[PDB]
Amino acid sequence: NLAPLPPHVPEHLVFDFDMYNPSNLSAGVQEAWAVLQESNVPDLVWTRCNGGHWIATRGQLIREAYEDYRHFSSECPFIPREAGEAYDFIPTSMDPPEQRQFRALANQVVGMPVVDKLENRIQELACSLIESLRPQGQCNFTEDYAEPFPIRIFMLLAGLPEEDIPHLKYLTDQMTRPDGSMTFAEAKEALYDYLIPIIEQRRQKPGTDAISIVANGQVNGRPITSDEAKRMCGLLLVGGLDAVVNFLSFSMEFLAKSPEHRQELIERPERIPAACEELLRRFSLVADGRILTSDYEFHGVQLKKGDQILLPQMLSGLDERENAAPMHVDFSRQKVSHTTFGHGSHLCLGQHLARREIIVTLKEWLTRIPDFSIAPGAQIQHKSGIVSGVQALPLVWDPATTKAV
Ligand code: HEM
Ligand SMILES: CC1(C)[C@@H]2CC[C@@]1(C)C(=O)C2
Ligand SMILES: [K+]
Ligand SMILES: [K+]
């Protein structure tokens, strides 16, 4: 329902957008969020949905707010407020200067040096999964590739058993796109409960996996505590099991419906990295925010201490003020502007792993299954939330048109 409009929020700035169930969802989730960028919509609006909160609708404000951590704090980064208040993941719930010592440790476990090391394994897994699907002439992309490819790689990095994925994925799903079975707080508590004994076990018998590295790590010279390790490992799990998975599906859904773009990458594979970036812009999918630390006038609007403001990372790149004909996918786009991996001090630490996974997928899939389409009649459904996603993606193809490598 709609929360009563607070006395300080101008009546004319009200736009009741529901980030968990946008009205234009059937047209595609990015299209649904883009309604916030239609002709008569202000740069900053207030929605009475989900408890009531501000929403910056243009890249200019989104970037500015993410850069000003003194006014826009990460302490309560999720909407609804109850979720944001329970949210204590490290380093994401912290603002600089406190954030830095923890972010450095996190970067060491998922950063570029680590992705370089996972290269061959990422490559091998992508190829094995695709080769097994190839002769079948069909697949449920979300469950047969989007999920197993990146998640198995992350579980390998974290040294966690793959049989634990169903439980962990159910929990992360409730934190980003809740179905109602669990509140954010309940899902977080369950994720922490899962981690507690594992962290204790690896602090006693350290391994070479990500959890061991975090649990036995140091933060600017001093030993990390068990609680801190838990709050950081929980965040790494959420980061590695959701966004990339859903992004792969948005991208493949698009390629399945646009033979022309597939052909472009088939004929010119060297354009894959650039295509990856353009797809990251067009099918951006994350949207979290910040909380006002004090009363502050921002772009002519009076924000009050405690107000929550959603700063959709997804919207910057779809903003026509940042990219002409934003809804059009142009792998040759000159200046691909976006904040898909965030902006400011909290820039995504797993973006290098994500780009590698996306590029590897595009290359290895198009090489074996150049021609494919969405199952006839299928009405693809998207879901909206902190991280938007694709419910299911049934694909089909003629095995005769494929080739083994
Ligand atoms: C296409 C995939 C991905 C997208 C679009 C994405 C997007 C984002 C965004 C928007 C943020 C900033 C959130 C904020 O400012 O509140 C973020 C932070 C982060 N992401 Fe990603 N991410 C992706 C994949 C990954 C992967 C694979 C990992 C690996 C575990 C990961 C780990 C992290 C971490 C640890 C942070 C927190 C950094 C900090 O708070 O300083 N991400 N991501
Ligand atoms: C918004 C995010 C993508 C980012 C990494 C996982 C996530 C859901 C967070 O809680 C911080
Ligand atoms: K008012
Ligand atoms: K909090």
Written account of the structure:
- Keywords: Cytoplasm, Heme, Iron, Metal-binding, Monooxygenase, Oxidoreductase.
- It is found in: Cytoplasm.
- Involved in a camphor oxidation system.
- It is an enzyme of class 1 (oxidoreductase).
- There is one protein chain.
- The protein has 405 residues and is of the alpha+beta class.
- It has one domain: Cytochrome P450 (Cytochrome p450), CATH 1.10.630.
- Helix content is 46%, strand content 10%.
- The strands form five sheets. The chain has a five-stranded mixed beta sheet with strand order 1-2-10-7-3. A three-stranded antiparallel beta sheet has the order 4-14-11. It has a two-stranded antiparallel sheet with strand order 5-6.
- 45% of the residues are buried.
- It binds protoporphyrin IX containing FE, camphor and potassium ion (2 copies).
- Residues 74, 77, 91-92, 103, 106, 110, 235-236, 239-240, 243-244, 247, 286, 288, 313, 340-342, 346, 348-350, 353-354 line the site of protoporphyrin IX containing FE.
